[model samples]
Target: KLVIWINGDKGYNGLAEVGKKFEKDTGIKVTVEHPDKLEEKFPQVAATGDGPDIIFWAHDRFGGYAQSGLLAEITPDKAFQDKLYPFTWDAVRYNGKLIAYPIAVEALSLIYNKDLLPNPPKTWEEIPALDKELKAKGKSALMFNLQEPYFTWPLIAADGGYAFKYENGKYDIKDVGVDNAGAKAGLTFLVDLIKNKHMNADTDYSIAEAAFNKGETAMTINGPWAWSNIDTSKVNYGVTVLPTFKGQPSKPFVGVLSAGINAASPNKELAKEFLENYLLTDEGLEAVNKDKPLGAVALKSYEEELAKDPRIAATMENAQKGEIMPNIPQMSAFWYAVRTAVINAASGRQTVDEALKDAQTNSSS
Candidate 1:
């Protein structure tokens, strides 16, 4: 018998189907579990050398986890790497180590209520005009979780900013670009959203999601993960790459959901074979979509087939315009320090300059 731990999401249920097929074929019992707070839970449990054979999660968290010695490395054959879209490799490879087997490539896009926007705006300035019209009609123009860097970083990228400097195909954590001139421009746009775009700073994921799901907001910066919760019968939503930010495409962070063998797991060989032979196969990939297909699977051939679906196509389009989030240990500080800078500036708690320096200080620490 083998166990796979996942943080609870619909993806866990999708993985359950794969577990069943593996048991049927391999005569090995497989179970799916929801390990609450698995992101933090993994390192703690793995330290004790007792954990599930596999863990599934986005690659954004891989660097720190890998650096901590919690994950085992994978060296895939060239043919296996060829199956995935090239840049997807950037998400799993960490500090000279191949950390995980990537599943899907996901990025944020502007999801709008089709009933509200028969034709979506193509430029940033056009959004406010629509917002004004919507205000008159007692609805909002756009909304998103403003305090979260994951949602806001795209604008920074649109203006030629990045969280860390990249050179020689790797990130230089010592150099952070989030506070640069480019990011300030993106931060200014976010401030405008707070002050003029009718966005509520208090509106978190659930709030924004519920508002959109209930047809309260015209648009939200979200992705395919949010698709299942949307009341399509009432919401009438459509997915598209976010409109330009200050005339530049608002490229977002592309996160790939990946599976890895835990170094602590007793069943390493079986787990590796399952990922390579079972999970990576066409039939295995199909089980991952018992609901709707989750974003675009990392496999290139699979993504080509998925592109026919508009949602998958939109995600890939956004990914093309964006950069993959770096899988580097320093990214651990980025989530906290950089996000605080954006949040503080957006809420008027600090000047962009003050906020950025504070982030630099924390990041350096």
Candidate 2:
């Protein structure tokens, strides 16, 4: 019998469903404590190390709580922690130990003004028609930061494309896929978008937000991070997950907040065993995602499930479909490479092929 609890198995529905199989196999029962005002209750709950085992919330709300010495350092298999999106690992890492188990990330869910776009595009194929309609009205259908790869990547990742492919569950820096046929198709699509006069070459993310806020554009491919910048006062905008492209989920870098064990847990070793053995495992991730098919699933094995979900599934699939913006120090070169290409190509100083290849080539640095 393999029995373990990786924090709050009883408290968070997320942790239990993922670990149920472990307990069923191990013949052990886990106890959990659920309290109101969870974050505020945490100090007392975690200090005893006998209350709830995990705390799940937004990263913006996570750091301060964990820093006060309630969360545990991820041990025994911290190397596998690399499997998560780069920033996710860093978002939860404080006080020297991996304190969070990142399970998924949220990316850009498309928001549009229905008055400008009477019929929002359900598929990428429908975008051109909307663009043409908007152009006829002297308005642009879509707007976003053309010079930022983070915003640009959603267009580039369909048809099995990405900044790099995972070979053997790890990054192959030597195998940059920016020039692949899929990405090339996407790049060509963007050039056509600009050529058709649906948008101007001058729109940066700043311009995009201003345009949308000012009612100058019909729609934009942006993310939750931009909500603060959105004036929300100028237009009645609605948000939905990005549309699939050419029958594939579009890509957008996603970020997530996760739950972790308290370093002060009385069941520390048991908690570690539970995490190391089940929840983070390939099979374990499937169970976890099955419960709430949200965000880009952090693990690779369940990638398809992300796409199949009907409600926010496409958005989750998009996040899974996109780039992670790797957390390693070497990623500086990746950023420098891509951002440079965006500037060169967007400004017409270089062809799309020339600009994209520059990103691929410079990432080697």
Candidate 3:
């Protein structure tokens, strides 16, 4: 038996559908389990050698597992790795070995209402005038999760701020850059948006999306997963790469959804077979996509299919332009630290400098 832990019903059903054929050929039954809070449970259970042979999750969450020696290093070979988008492969690599197999990619981009704005602005400098014009018309120009680091990183990244310094093929967690000059500039820009009344200080994921859905907002920065809930029937929207900020590109963090093998599993080789031969194939991914769209599939073979969905295509383009999210265990700290920085500064609890200085201290410790 090959036991796999997937996340949702659609994901389980998709794998179960493909597992039928694997069972027929190998005479090995496949069991797909959907567990709540798999991320929290996986590490605890996996440490004891009691975890599933395979598990599905985003790349960012597995770095701790890799560091704990709980994951089996996958060898897809250089040529095989190239089959996926460059960043997708990069996402699964820790140290020098491939720790997981990437399946799909996601990134933030410009999602605009075609009726309200035929074209998106090209840079951050253009937003103030646009916001004024839209505010006069009783609509907000653009809004996103203002206090969330994940959603707001592009603004910070535009000016060279980053969570960690990456060099020599690895991330330096010691060199947290949140309090640096570039990051301070980015954080200040966010505060100015709220102070200048260009964007609401209270705007969050739900509020931003709700306003966009109701046609009260012209555009937003969102990921592809948002399409399922967006009221497309009400808003004729278009997806495109993010605009520049002060002549520098706004680079969002690129996330990758991947399948990882358990190092302690007895059937390690067989698990790899199930993943490499049965799951990563084009037909296997197609079955999964039918149940739930795998937006921006990692495989280069799916480019033409991705093109058919304009939103997915645009997201893929944005993904290409973004940085692979650092998948080290320390990233968890970075999130909390950065979020605190953004929230404290935006709410007037602290100045941008003080907030970032605190964030840098917290993240480093």
Candidate 4:
């Protein structure tokens, strides 16, 4: 028998369907479970050798778990490895070892209402003109979570700002780049947009998203997770790569959703067979995606089929051009400090230098 644990309700729905096929073929019973507080309880339970054989989750949390000897290493066949996006594999890698299976990938992009903006602008320079034209018609050109690091980092990154310096296959904790010149240029771009009346200073994720949902805003910066909400409203939207920032393309952080095996599982070999031979196959990925539509499937072979959905096509394209999120444990501090600093700058509470200095100082702590 093989057992898998997942945190949410529908995440495992397609996995269950795939497991049934595996059970029918191999005569190995499969069970899918959704336990509350799986994230909080997993480490403690895994330490006792009583946890489920498999766990479905995003790749970020598994880095520390893998480093702590909680996850078993994975080595799928070369042919299978070749079928997935290279970026997805990077997300599951820790210290040059593959520790998890990539399922789907996601990244932020520009989502626009087709009815309002038939042709999306190709650069930030175009936004000011569009904003003025839209204001004449009582609509905004763009609105996003102004203070969100996840959505705004693309701007900073395009100009060379980063949370940590990654080189020689590892991150340097001592080299924080938030306060550098490139980052200052990016933040100044946002500040200039506000000063020039091209963007609002007070918009949050909820406020910006609500305006987009109500058709009051032409565009927003968001990820695939916002698709369901946008569809629920009467919005005709299209997703695309973000506009160029000073002639540099935006590079959003790509997050991969993956599955990994518990190190202490007695059925580790069986879990490996199930993952590689069944879950990673084209049919298996299709089944899971059917139950829970993914922003971007990791399989290169599946891209043509998935691209039929325009949303998936643009998101996959963005993922192809995106950077993998750093999986180091220190990322927790980076998130808090960066978001607060960006918020402070966006709200006019501090200059770009002051906010970024706070970010640099706090993240280094």
Candidate 1 stretches greater than 4 Å from native? 231-234
TM-score of each: 0.92, 0.57, 0.83, 0.79
For model 1, residues 69-94, the per-residue Cα lDDT tens digits are 98999878888888887767777888
Q: Summing lDDT over every window of 10 consecutive residues in candidate 1, give the lowest-scoring window.
A: 285-294
Query: Residue by residue across 243-273, what tens digits does model 3's lDDT show?
Result: 8876888878887879999898888777877
lDDT of each: 0.79, 0.63, 0.82, 0.83
Q: Tell me model 4's lDDT, rounded to 2 decimals.
A: 0.83
Error of 1 at 345 (Å): 2.7
Which 10-residue span in candidate 4 carries the lowest summed lDDT? 6-15
lDDT of 1 at 42: 83
Positional deviation of 123 in candidate 4, in angstroms? 2.2
The per-residue C-alpha lDDT of model 1 at residue 228 equals: 74
Clashing pairs in 3: none
Residue pairs in collision within model 1? none
Model 3, which residues run further than 4 Å from truth?
1-37, 48-53, 75-87, 136-138, 196-198, 264-273, 290-292, 307-313
TM-score-best of 1 and 3: 1
lDDT score, candidate 1: 0.79
Q: Which has the higher lDDT value, candidate number 1 or candidate number 4?
A: 4
